[PDB]
Amino acid sequence: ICGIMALASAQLYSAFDFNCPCLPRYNLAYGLGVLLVPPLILFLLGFVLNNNVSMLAEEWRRPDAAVLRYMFCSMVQRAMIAPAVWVSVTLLDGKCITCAFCTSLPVEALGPQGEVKRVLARIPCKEIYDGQELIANEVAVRYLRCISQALGWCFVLLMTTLAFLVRSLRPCFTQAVFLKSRYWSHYIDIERKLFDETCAEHAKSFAKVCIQQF
Amino acid sequence: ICGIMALASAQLYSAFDFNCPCLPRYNLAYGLGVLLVPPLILFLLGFVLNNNVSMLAEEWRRPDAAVLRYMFCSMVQRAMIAPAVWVSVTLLDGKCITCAFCTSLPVEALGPQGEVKRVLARIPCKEIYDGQELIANEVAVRYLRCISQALGWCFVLLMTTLAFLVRSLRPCFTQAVFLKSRYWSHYIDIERKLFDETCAEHAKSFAKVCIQQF
Amino acid sequence: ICGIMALASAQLYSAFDFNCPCLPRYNLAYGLGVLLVPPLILFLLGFVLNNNVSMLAEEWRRPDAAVLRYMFCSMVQRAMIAPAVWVSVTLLDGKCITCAFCTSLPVEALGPQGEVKRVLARIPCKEIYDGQELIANEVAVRYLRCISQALGWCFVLLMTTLAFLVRSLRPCFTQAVFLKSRYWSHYIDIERKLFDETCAEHAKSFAKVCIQQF
Amino acid sequence: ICGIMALASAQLYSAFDFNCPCLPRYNLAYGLGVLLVPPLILFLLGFVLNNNVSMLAEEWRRPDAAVLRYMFCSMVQRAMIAPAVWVSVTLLDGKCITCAFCTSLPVEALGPQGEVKRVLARIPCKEIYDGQELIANEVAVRYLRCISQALGWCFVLLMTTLAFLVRSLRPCFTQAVFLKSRYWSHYIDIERKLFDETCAEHAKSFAKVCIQQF
Amino acid sequence: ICGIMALASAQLYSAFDFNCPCLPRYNLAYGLGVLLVPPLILFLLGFVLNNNVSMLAEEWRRPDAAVLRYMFCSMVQRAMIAPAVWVSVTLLDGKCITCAFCTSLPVEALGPQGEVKRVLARIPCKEIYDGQELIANEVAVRYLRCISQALGWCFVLLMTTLAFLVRSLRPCFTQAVFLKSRYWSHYIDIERKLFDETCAEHAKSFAKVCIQQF
Amino acid sequence: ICGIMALASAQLYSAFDFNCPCLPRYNLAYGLGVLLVPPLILFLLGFVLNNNVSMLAEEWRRPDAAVLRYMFCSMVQRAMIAPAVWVSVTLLDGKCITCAFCTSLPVEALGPQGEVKRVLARIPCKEIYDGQELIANEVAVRYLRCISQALGWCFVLLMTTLAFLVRSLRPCFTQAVFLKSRYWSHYIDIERKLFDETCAEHAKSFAKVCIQQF
Amino acid sequence: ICGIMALASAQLYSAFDFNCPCLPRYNLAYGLGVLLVPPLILFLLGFVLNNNVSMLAEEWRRPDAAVLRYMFCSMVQRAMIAPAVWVSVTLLDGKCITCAFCTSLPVEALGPQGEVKRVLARIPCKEIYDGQELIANEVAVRYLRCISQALGWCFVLLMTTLAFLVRSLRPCFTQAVFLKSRYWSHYIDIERKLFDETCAEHAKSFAKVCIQQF
Amino acid sequence: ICGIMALASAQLYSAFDFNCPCLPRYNLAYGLGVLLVPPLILFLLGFVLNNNVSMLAEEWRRPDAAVLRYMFCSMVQRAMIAPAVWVSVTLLDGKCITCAFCTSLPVEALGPQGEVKRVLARIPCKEIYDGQELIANEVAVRYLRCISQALGWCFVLLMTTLAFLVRSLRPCFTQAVFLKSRYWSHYIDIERKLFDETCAEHAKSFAKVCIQQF
């Protein structure tokens, strides 16, 4: 299911009309917003769509021992891969960082202080930019997009090395707990299915009793 | 079925020709209209297309005990997910809030009083805007669209956290009522099917009796 | 079958080349025409394509008791959903009302009397409009299209609340008549099928008798 | 089969390159031509592609009683639905009436007499129109297309109400003739099939006799 | 098979790059060429692709009685429907007649004699036309295309009425010859199939004898 | 297989970037090249892809009687239909003859001698043509393309009448040789298949013997 | 699985918006970055998605003999083919080397020193290039892209000859270790499957015991 | 498999961005490079993807008799058909020879010596060509592309006649070696399959022994 989740997240980002309020202060709270909030939403949706969550909540409510811990630490990892993809693609595109850290790039060396902040804030994604002064247009876009793509590649490498270090090592892979978990997960589904079966059967008998009065 | 409902709602919004009556007063009653009425229509259609509704209405007409309450509080949740999607996408696009709260943005600081209201009302989605005075064009569009997308993300987060808090907690999940509900829902369908079967059989016998006179 | 009917009605409206005779009087009789006549045609086609209609007509010709009434009041509802969709989409597009009530909008306040009627009649869907005088062009289009879409949303809400109030309440849902109707509808089809079967068999025997003379 | 016939007729009209000989007299004999002749061709093709036609012709050649009449009055109705669709779409498009009744619209009030006829004949579908004199261009097109679409809607309503009045009423629906017709139609096909079967069998025997000399 | 033949003929005409040698005399021998030769080619290909042709030729070589005549008069009709479609579409498009009878239309009344012939020959499908003199450009195109489409409709009606008059009437439909023909056509195929079967079997035996020496 | 061969040849011609070396002498050796060499390549590929060729070569190497002759005269005909299609389409397009016989058309009557040859050689497929002198541009293109398409139609008619005259007449159709050929062609395939079968079986036994030492 | 990995890597490179920070020093650390880091990420993902990795890690943790070595040296080769494809396509496109070694090409012979470095750094992928001085634009692009494609072809040849030299020669192909590896790989999967089977069965028994109290 | 190889090679050539370093000397080493190296890579990949190669290498390592020779001379022919297709299409397009032999065409007769070499080297695929001097632009392109396509057709004919001369004649087609080869190729696959089977079975037994301790 997580595959359709990743594809849906990428396609949804392909359908989000990004645009920056070219204002001196609200930028830092919009780029980071688009960068962080949809990850949180997808990370919670990773818990909504799962089925074991009800059982785990019910068992954690009443005050086995560690198999619950493994189930939880496995569901978290299973759900964590959607926000990673979202952050990855939205850093590789670059519009987010261009929107966020536009009012801070060093104009003095690399490429009214309040008015300076105003213009540099107007820098990204606009044809309302003052223009030549203190920066060109395409230069401040290319610099920020390079920084963004570098952060994106570094982050993807970090997430991938964590994923590689988790699927080989110690974090709750002792075979006993694994077997107990698989047994529990099979038993719950078998119980639901067989209850549905016997319920349907008893209901069929009752309905045959009731119908034939006419 | 709710999946095809969500896809149909999104595609229908993709086929609704939005446009704003650039008038001083009717805006507040058009943006909010497009924002609120189609949600109500979809929320009622969530009850039309369902089948249990007839049984629930019939049982509630005559003056078990709580299983009806669970069936109702489950059907409501099942139907609630179409208006959420509609409001989400129509806030993320931004045309609705741009249409509604255009005659109120502070022109004095951020970016004839009656004439002022008239022009600021003409602001959105038009090439009939007065232009330079008291605001640019793209600035008042970007500001309002940023506000709209922020509200949209906040709302999606709110609906998702409610959905996550409901599918794990107390609101009528005691196993007894759940089992009674599943039993009832299986019995109704089995009754309808078996009645159809025996009716077809008796009819076949009667028809074989009637036909062979020729 | 009604689903393909709704899709066909919408697609047919997508293939009807609308255009307004920019004349002082014929408008009111063209917008309303396109709005009302195709609904009537689709509502009658809802009776043509149905099969029970022959039986109902035959039984109503000779001067059970109420099961006919239920069959009729059910077929009417089954057929009513095509004109609703047609009126809905042709009000949401807006060209119909723009064509109809163009010669009446108040030019004095909101946005030769005979010549005035002539021009305001020429208003919609034309590049032959006089222009600046007494109205702009895009303003009288936007105002009328807003009115049209408001009427459309109100109408869709009205039809949907009627549909929701019918599929839960009193109008001939007493189980006895429902069962009698289902029995009748199964018996008619079973009779036709079995008559076809026995007829084919007797014909096969006769044909085997006739053929083998050569 | 009639469904593919209707779709083929509509698609063929979508592939007929209409154009008007802008001449004073030949118009009336070209619009009406395109309007009437292809209906006749399709109405005859409705008899070619049918199979019962041979039997009916053979039985009518020699000088039961009324079952032939029902078969004929049913085949006619079955074939009549292609020209209806053709006339419907070619009136809704409007080019036919624009081509035909262009040399007659009243130029004096609504919107050398011989030269007048010549120009008004040149009116439709041309950029060789004289222009301003006695009419505009788009006005005489819109007026005629409105008239055409009105005739088209009226005609579709007429054909549909006839179709609804036929499939419920008296015209040869007495069950005896209907049963005789169905019996005859099953017997003919069964005879052909079984003759083919026995012929193939006898031929197989003969061929096995002949082949094995080598 | 004739259906794929008709579709292939139409699509091939959709892929034939028509162009007229704007010369005084060769026109009459190019329009008629494109009009007549491909019909002959398709009419012969209707005999190539058929299988009965070999048998009929073989039986006609040596100097039953009339069943051969029916087989021939049926194969001819079966093959005749490709050139009809070709001529139909290539008259409805109109380029053929425009190319052929361009050097003959009456320039004097309706719309150096040698030079006149030269120009009128240059009339069709060219931007090298002299222009205003003695004719316009679009007028002589529209007139000829109208004539062509009229001939096309008349021809399609003629072919269709012949097809309708043949599939109901006298031309060799006496049941005896029909049955003999069907018997012959089944016997030939059964003979070929069964010979192939027994040949394969004897060959399998021989090959099993030969192979197992190794 | 020959169908996919014809389609592949046509599509390959649709992917051959034709262009003419506008030189006085090399033309005659380029048009004819593109016209003749790919036919030879396809005619040899008709022998490569066939399977009987090995058997026929092997039997012809050693110095029955006439069945080999029939197999050969049948394989040749089977392979001959690809170059026919290639020549047909590459004559109907016309670029080949336009490229070849461009330096020969009579400029004097119909439409430095060395310089004349040079220009007329430059005529086709170029915007480097001298222009007005002794010929226009589109005239010498249309004349040559008409000649090419006439040759193409004549050639297609010739090949089709040969194909029709071969599939009905004398060239080695005596039933004895035909039967011997079919028998031989079945026996070869049956031998190969059954040898493969018995070989696989003996190998399976041997492998089961060898494997189970471990 | 590696096929979908190669296709996904190529398509992902088709969706990476490359762009160069036209700066004097950061180039060398951006071209090489895009060239080297995604290969490392894909090479680690080649270990994540594989299943044997857990077993190999577990066995290597505790301090047979060489079969582990073969499994490892086979998994490495299996995973190595994604970075090869990535480097291949991103060298054949050429943007990487154009971005990296742009500040070094010899301007003096082939095609303020600090300012020279600045301009030559600005060379690639920009319309902000100084222009004529010391180099053209398209020349320094073509030269670098030729160098890049030459390196790409050389690298693809190198990787392919290594792949050909490995799949024929000595590196741990002794049949004993190969058989032991295949046995181990079959046994692990069979163990997992059969454990799942017996676990499901015991769970079904337990659930049937538990359910039927109601 | 070789079919997908040919299609992949052609499509890959459709995705190789060709471009010429317009330099006096490197051309001869770039056209020939693109012409020759990818053929070598594909010819080696024809050995990588094959499976028999391991067996042949293993048997050739230790110092039957001639069946190995036939297997080798068959695998070589099987793999040789990808570079043929590559060279064919990359000669028919013409860019390769245009890139290679551009600095050599005789400018004196047909169409500073160092500067002459420089310009003629700049000739192909550039809009940086000096222009009129000593050659036009399109002429030197057409001449070289004609030469290239002539070489391409000659080469395709050569490869096809070799392929036709090999699949009919002497090169190791004696039936004994062919049968031995087919036997060997069946035995190897049967051995691998049956070993896998028995290994899976023994492993299943062992795993059933091990699992049921819990």
PDB file of all heavy atoms in Angstrom, chain B residues 108-123, unseen atoms left out:
ATOM      1  N   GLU B 108      -3.791  50.000   3.437  1.00  0.00           N
ATOM      2  CA  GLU B 108      -3.050  51.113   4.011  1.00  0.00           C
ATOM      3  C   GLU B 108      -1.605  50.750   4.316  1.00  0.00           C
ATOM      4  O   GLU B 108      -0.692  51.515   3.991  1.00  0.00           O
ATOM      5  CB  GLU B 108      -3.740  51.605   5.285  1.00  0.00           C
ATOM      6  CG  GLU B 108      -5.104  52.236   5.048  1.00  0.00           C
ATOM      7  CD  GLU B 108      -5.787  52.644   6.338  1.00  0.00           C
ATOM      8  OE1 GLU B 108      -5.291  52.268   7.421  1.00  0.00           O
ATOM      9  OE2 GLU B 108      -6.824  53.339   6.270  1.00  0.00           O
ATOM     10  N   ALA B 109      -1.373  49.594   4.936  1.00  0.00           N
ATOM     11  CA  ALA B 109      -0.042  49.290   5.445  1.00  0.00           C
ATOM     12  C   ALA B 109       0.626  48.125   4.725  1.00  0.00           C
ATOM     13  O   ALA B 109       1.748  48.264   4.227  1.00  0.00           O
ATOM     14  CB  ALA B 109      -0.112  49.005   6.938  1.00  0.00           C
ATOM     15  N   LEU B 110      -0.048  46.976   4.666  1.00  0.00           N
ATOM     16  CA  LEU B 110       0.611  45.753   4.218  1.00  0.00           C
ATOM     17  C   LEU B 110       1.102  45.876   2.781  1.00  0.00           C
ATOM     18  O   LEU B 110       2.311  45.925   2.529  1.00  0.00           O
ATOM     19  CB  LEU B 110      -0.338  44.559   4.345  1.00  0.00           C
ATOM     20  N   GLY B 111       0.184  45.942   1.829  1.00  0.00           N
ATOM     21  CA  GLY B 111       0.568  45.993   0.427  1.00  0.00           C
ATOM     22  C   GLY B 111       0.230  47.348  -0.180  1.00  0.00           C
ATOM     23  O   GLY B 111       0.886  48.347   0.115  1.00  0.00           O
ATOM     24  N   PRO B 112     -12.484  58.498  -1.488  1.00  0.00           N
ATOM     25  CA  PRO B 112     -13.861  58.063  -1.283  1.00  0.00           C
ATOM     26  C   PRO B 112     -13.907  56.595  -0.870  1.00  0.00           C
ATOM     27  O   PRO B 112     -13.572  55.712  -1.658  1.00  0.00           O
ATOM     28  CB  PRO B 112     -14.503  58.251  -2.660  1.00  0.00           C
ATOM     29  CG  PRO B 112     -13.388  58.057  -3.628  1.00  0.00           C
ATOM     30  CD  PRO B 112     -12.181  57.773  -2.791  1.00  0.00           C
ATOM     31  N   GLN B 113     -14.333  56.348   0.371  1.00  0.00           N
ATOM     32  CA  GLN B 113     -14.333  54.989   0.905  1.00  0.00           C
ATOM     33  C   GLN B 113     -15.175  54.052   0.051  1.00  0.00           C
ATOM     34  O   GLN B 113     -14.782  52.904  -0.188  1.00  0.00           O
ATOM     35  CB  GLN B 113     -14.843  54.996   2.345  1.00  0.00           C
ATOM     36  CG  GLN B 113     -14.847  53.632   3.010  1.00  0.00           C
ATOM     37  CD  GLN B 113     -13.452  53.112   3.285  1.00  0.00           C
ATOM     38  OE1 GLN B 113     -12.567  53.860   3.697  1.00  0.00           O
ATOM     39  NE2 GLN B 113     -13.250  51.819   3.063  1.00  0.00           N
ATOM     40  N   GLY B 114     -16.332  54.518  -0.417  1.00  0.00           N
ATOM     41  CA  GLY B 114     -17.167  53.676  -1.257  1.00  0.00           C
ATOM     42  C   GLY B 114     -16.479  53.291  -2.551  1.00  0.00           C
ATOM     43  O   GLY B 114     -16.514  52.128  -2.962  1.00  0.00           O
ATOM     44  N   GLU B 115     -15.842  54.259  -3.208  1.00  0.00           N
ATOM     45  CA  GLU B 115     -15.076  53.941  -4.405  1.00  0.00           C
ATOM     46  C   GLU B 115     -13.928  52.994  -4.091  1.00  0.00           C
ATOM     47  O   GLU B 115     -13.609  52.117  -4.901  1.00  0.00           O
ATOM     48  CB  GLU B 115     -14.551  55.222  -5.054  1.00  0.00           C
ATOM     49  CG  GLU B 115     -13.934  55.018  -6.432  1.00  0.00           C
ATOM     50  CD  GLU B 115     -14.897  55.321  -7.562  1.00  0.00           C
ATOM     51  OE1 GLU B 115     -15.997  55.845  -7.286  1.00  0.00           O
ATOM     52  OE2 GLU B 115     -14.553  55.039  -8.729  1.00  0.00           O
ATOM     53  N   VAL B 116     -13.295  53.158  -2.928  1.00  0.00           N
ATOM     54  CA  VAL B 116     -12.246  52.228  -2.527  1.00  0.00           C
ATOM     55  C   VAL B 116     -12.795  50.814  -2.458  1.00  0.00           C
ATOM     56  O   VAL B 116     -12.191  49.867  -2.977  1.00  0.00           O
ATOM     57  CB  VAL B 116     -11.634  52.658  -1.184  1.00  0.00           C
ATOM     58  CG1 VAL B 116     -10.663  51.606  -0.694  1.00  0.00           C
ATOM     59  CG2 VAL B 116     -10.935  53.993  -1.332  1.00  0.00           C
ATOM     60  N   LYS B 117     -13.939  50.647  -1.794  1.00  0.00           N
ATOM     61  CA  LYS B 117     -14.573  49.339  -1.743  1.00  0.00           C
ATOM     62  C   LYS B 117     -14.862  48.826  -3.141  1.00  0.00           C
ATOM     63  O   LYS B 117     -14.649  47.648  -3.430  1.00  0.00           O
ATOM     64  CB  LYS B 117     -15.855  49.408  -0.919  1.00  0.00           C
ATOM     65  CG  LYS B 117     -15.634  49.788   0.533  1.00  0.00           C
ATOM     66  CD  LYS B 117     -14.994  48.656   1.318  1.00  0.00           C
ATOM     67  CE  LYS B 117     -16.005  47.567   1.634  1.00  0.00           C
ATOM     68  NZ  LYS B 117     -17.075  48.048   2.547  1.00  0.00           N
ATOM     69  N   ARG B 118     -15.325  49.703  -4.030  1.00  0.00           N
ATOM     70  CA  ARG B 118     -15.644  49.271  -5.386  1.00  0.00           C
ATOM     71  C   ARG B 118     -14.413  48.718  -6.089  1.00  0.00           C
ATOM     72  O   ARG B 118     -14.446  47.620  -6.658  1.00  0.00           O
ATOM     73  CB  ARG B 118     -16.240  50.431  -6.180  1.00  0.00           C
ATOM     74  CG  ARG B 118     -16.594  50.083  -7.616  1.00  0.00           C
ATOM     75  CD  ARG B 118     -17.721  50.960  -8.134  1.00  0.00           C
ATOM     76  NE  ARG B 118     -18.869  50.959  -7.234  1.00  0.00           N
ATOM     77  CZ  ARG B 118     -19.281  52.021  -6.549  1.00  0.00           C
ATOM     78  NH1 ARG B 118     -18.638  53.172  -6.662  1.00  0.00           N
ATOM     79  NH2 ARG B 118     -20.335  51.930  -5.753  1.00  0.00           N
ATOM     80  N   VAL B 119     -13.307  49.455  -6.043  1.00  0.00           N
ATOM     81  CA  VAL B 119     -12.108  48.998  -6.736  1.00  0.00           C
ATOM     82  C   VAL B 119     -11.589  47.711  -6.112  1.00  0.00           C
ATOM     83  O   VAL B 119     -11.393  46.699  -6.804  1.00  0.00           O
ATOM     84  CB  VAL B 119     -11.030  50.092  -6.740  1.00  0.00           C
ATOM     85  CG1 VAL B 119      -9.930  49.730  -7.720  1.00  0.00           C
ATOM     86  CG2 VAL B 119     -11.637  51.421  -7.105  1.00  0.00           C
ATOM     87  N   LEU B 120     -11.362  47.719  -4.798  1.00  0.00           N
ATOM     88  CA  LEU B 120     -10.862  46.516  -4.151  1.00  0.00           C
ATOM     89  C   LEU B 120     -11.777  45.330  -4.405  1.00  0.00           C
ATOM     90  O   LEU B 120     -11.307  44.191  -4.467  1.00  0.00           O
ATOM     91  CB  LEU B 120     -10.692  46.756  -2.657  1.00  0.00           C
ATOM     92  CG  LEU B 120      -9.817  47.958  -2.324  1.00  0.00           C
ATOM     93  CD1 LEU B 120      -9.663  48.095  -0.828  1.00  0.00           C
ATOM     94  CD2 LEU B 120      -8.472  47.824  -2.996  1.00  0.00           C
ATOM     95  N   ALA B 121     -13.075  45.569  -4.572  1.00  0.00           N
ATOM     96  CA  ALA B 121     -13.962  44.491  -4.969  1.00  0.00           C
ATOM     97  C   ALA B 121     -13.652  44.041  -6.382  1.00  0.00           C
ATOM     98  O   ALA B 121     -13.726  42.851  -6.695  1.00  0.00           O
ATOM     99  CB  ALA B 121     -15.416  44.942  -4.853  1.00  0.00           C
ATOM    100  N   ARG B 122     -13.306  44.981  -7.251  1.00  0.00           N
ATOM    101  CA  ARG B 122     -12.969  44.596  -8.610  1.00  0.00           C
ATOM    102  C   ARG B 122     -11.635  43.870  -8.697  1.00  0.00           C
ATOM    103  O   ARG B 122     -11.346  43.284  -9.743  1.00  0.00           O
ATOM    104  CB  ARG B 122     -12.952  45.823  -9.513  1.00  0.00           C
ATOM    105  CG  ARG B 122     -14.306  46.483  -9.665  1.00  0.00           C
ATOM    106  CD  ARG B 122     -14.172  47.883 -10.220  1.00  0.00           C
ATOM    107  NE  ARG B 122     -15.354  48.273 -10.977  1.00  0.00           N
ATOM    108  CZ  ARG B 122     -15.578  47.916 -12.235  1.00  0.00           C
ATOM    109  NH1 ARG B 122     -14.698  47.161 -12.875  1.00  0.00           N
ATOM    110  NH2 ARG B 122     -16.680  48.313 -12.852  1.00  0.00           N
ATOM    111  N   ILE B 123     -10.836  43.889  -7.634  1.00  0.00           N
ATOM    112  CA  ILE B 123      -9.483  43.317  -7.631  1.00  0.00           C
ATOM    113  C   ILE B 123      -9.394  41.941  -8.287  1.00  0.00           C
ATOM    114  O   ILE B 123      -8.621  41.777  -9.240  1.00  0.00           O
ATOM    115  CB  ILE B 123      -8.912  43.236  -6.206  1.00  0.00           C
ATOM    116  CG1 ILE B 123      -8.347  44.582  -5.769  1.00  0.00           C
ATOM    117  CG2 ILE B 123      -7.818  42.192  -6.126  1.00  0.00           C
ATOM    118  CD1 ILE B 123      -7.776  44.556  -4.372  1.00  0.00           C
TER     119      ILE B 123
END
